[PDB]
Amino acid sequence: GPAVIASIAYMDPGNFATNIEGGARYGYSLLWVILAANLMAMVIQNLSANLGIASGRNLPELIRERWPRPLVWFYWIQAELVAMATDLAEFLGAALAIQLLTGLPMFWGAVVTGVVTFWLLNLQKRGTRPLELAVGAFVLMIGVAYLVQVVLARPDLAAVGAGFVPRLQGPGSAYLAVGIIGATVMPHVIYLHSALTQGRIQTDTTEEKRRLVRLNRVDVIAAMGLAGLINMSMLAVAAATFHGKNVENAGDLTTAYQTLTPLLGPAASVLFAVALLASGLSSSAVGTMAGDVIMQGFMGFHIPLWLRRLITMLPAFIVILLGMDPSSVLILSQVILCFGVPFALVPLLLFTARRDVMGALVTRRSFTVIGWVIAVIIIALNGYLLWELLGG
Residues 101-140 that bind ligand OLC (CB under 6 A): none
Residues 234-253 that bind Na ion (CB under 5 A): 252
Instruction: Tally Cβ neighbours within 10 Å of residue 204.
Output: 8
Element (H, E) at 300: none
If you ran DSSP here, which 8-state letter would residue 363 be given?
P
Closest CA to 187 of 15, 369, 339: 339
Q: Is 236 in the site for ligand OLC (CB under 6 A)?
A: yes
In contact, 286 and 7? CB cutoff 8 Å? no
Largest CA distance in the chain: 61
Q: Decide whether 5 or 95 has the Cβ nearer to Na ion.
A: 95
Q: Does 159 engage in binding with Cl ion (CB under 5 A)? A: yes
Q: What are the residues whose beta carbons fall under 8 Å from the beta carbon of 279, sequence distance 6 or more?
A: 8, 11, 12, 13, 16, 90, 93, 135, 138, 139
Chain residues 313-342 in contact with ligand OLC, contact rule CB under 6 A = 314-315, 318, 336, 339-340, 342
Q: How many residues bind ligand OLC (CB under 6 A)?
A: 92
Instruction: Phi first, then psi: give them for residue 339, nearest 5 degrees.
Output: -75, -15
Nearer to ligand OLC, 125 or 149 (CB): 149
Residues 278-307 within binding reach of ligand OLC (CB under 6 A): 304, 306
Cβ 66 to ligand OLC shortest distance, Å: 7
Following DSSP, what letter does each residue of 104-168 receive, concatenated? --HHHHHHHHHHHHHHHHS--TTTHHHHHHHHHHHHHHHHHHHHHHHHHT---HHHHHHHTS---
- Report CA-CA distances (Å) from 211 to 47, 165, 200: 15, 37, 11
Could you say whether residue 327 binds Na ion (CB under 5 A)? yes
Choose among Cl ion, Na ion, ligand OLC, none what residue 159 binds, the Cβ cut-off being 5 to 8 Å by kind.
Cl ion
> How crowded is residue 306: how many other Cβ atoms within 10 Å of its Cβ?
11
* Choices 38-46, 90-98, 193-201, 286-294 (CB under 6 A): range interacting with ligand OLC: 38-46
CA dist 99 and 111 (Å) reads 12
Q: CA 276 to CA 12: how far, in whole Å? A: 8
User: SS3 of 30, please?
Assistant: coil
User: Applying CB under 6 A, which part among 3-11, 32-40, 103-111, 125-133 lies near ligand OLC?
Assistant: 32-40
Distance CA(155)–CA(168), nearest Å, equals 21
Q: Near Cl ion by CB under 5 A, which window of 158-166, 193-201, 291-299, 362-370?
A: 158-166
What's the min distance (Å) between Cβ of 31 and Cl ion?
A: 12
Q: Is 200 in the site for ligand OLC (CB under 6 A)?
A: no
Among residues 125 and 390, whose Cβ is nearest to ligand OLC? 390
Q: Does 334 bind Na ion (CB under 5 A)?
A: no
Q: Which does 219 bind (CB under 5 to 8 A by kind): Cl ion, ligand OLC, Na ion, none?
A: none
User: How big is the CA angle at 180 (ends 174 and 184), to the nearest 5 degrees?
Assistant: 145
Q: For residues 248-267, which are near ligand OLC according to CB under 6 A?
A: 266-267
Contact 47, 349 (CB under 8 A): yes
Give the integer Cα–Cα distance in Å for 14 and 380.
22
Rank residues 116 and 324 by Cβ distance to Na ion and give the closer one. Answer: 324
Query: With binding defined as CB under 6 A, does residue 311 bind ligand OLC?
Result: yes
Residue 42 interacts with ligand OLC (CB under 6 A): yes or no: yes
Closest distance to Cl ion from the beta carbon of 27 (Å) = 5
Shorter beta-carbon distance to ligand OLC: residue 195 or 294: 294
96, 183, 271, 285: residue in contact with ligand OLC (rule CB under 6 A):
271
* Site for Cl ion contains 168 (CB under 5 A): no
269 touches ligand OLC (CB under 6 A): yes
The candidate with the shortest Cα–Cα distance to 228, out of 43, 35, 44, 3, is 35
Phi, psi of 334 (to 5 degrees): -65, -30
157 binds ligand OLC (CB under 6 A): yes
Q: Which of residues 65-84 bind ligand OLC (CB under 6 A)?
A: 67, 69-71, 73-74, 77-78, 80-82, 84
| CA 335, 302, 90, 193 torsion-angle sign | positive
Residues 9-38 that bind Cl ion (CB under 5 A): 27
Figure out which of the listed residues 80, 292, 325, 388 binds Na ion, where binding follows CB under 5 A.
325
User: Which does residue 327 bind out of Cl ion, Na ion, ligand OLC, none, counting CB within 5 to 8 angstroms by kind?
Assistant: Na ion
Site residues (CB under 5 A) for Na ion?
252, 325-327
